[PDB]
Amino acid sequence: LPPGWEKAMSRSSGRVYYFNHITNASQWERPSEPARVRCSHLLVKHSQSRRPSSWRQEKITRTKEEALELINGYIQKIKSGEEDFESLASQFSDCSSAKARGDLGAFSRGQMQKPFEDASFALRTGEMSGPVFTDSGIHIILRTE
Numbered sequence: 001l002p003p004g005w006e007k008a009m010s011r012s013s014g015r016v017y018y019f020n021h022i023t024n025a026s027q028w029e030r031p032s033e034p035a036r037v038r039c040s041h042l043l044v045k046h047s048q049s050r051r052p053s054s055w056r057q058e059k060i061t062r063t064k065e066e067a068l069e070l071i072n073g074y075i076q077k078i079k080s081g082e083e084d085f086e087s088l089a090s091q092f093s094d095c096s097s098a099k100a101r102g103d104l105g106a107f108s109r110g111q112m113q114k115p116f117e118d119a120s121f122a123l124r125t126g127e128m129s130g131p132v133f134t135d136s137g138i139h140i141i142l143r144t145e
């Protein structure tokens, strides 16, 4: 299996699934390092965010727990096909990159907060993360190149 992935057993279903402890990805199906990667993301900030403010709300007052619920809801919608990533990032990301549909452009190791970096470099092109926690808040990331 590729870096970060593990196989596990779901008790309720009786079927194996896979999860990546670097990206927090999880899925029933079995999955399958460059200078630079390209990612879009969706950030939901909370009150312990480093800068608890965005283009959406001058003061962010939601708890970390609440921002986790919001992220979990976004994930559910992307995974069902109800909404697609770029679209929810444009409308709802607490990052100024919302206006680029969440695109951050290409970057190398050194540039982004380490948890965000590791997740991005653990994803393959086209793959999506689970909740990834930084000092900025909680993200979903989609690696595009």
Ligand SMILES: Cn1nc(-c2ccccc2)cc1C(=O)N[C@H](Cc1nc2ccccc2[nH]1)C(=O)O
Pocket (backbone or CB within 6 Å): 043, 051, 094, 095, 096, 097, 098, 100, 103, 104, 112, 113, 116, 134, 136
């Ligand atoms: C790193 N970056 N790029 C953009 C960006 C990209 C394209 C167009 C406009 C803004 C915004 C940012 C940024 O740091 N935004 C922060 C939120 C944030 N914190 C991050 C931590 C790690 C990775 C991305 C992150 N984004 C903010 O606005 O409060």
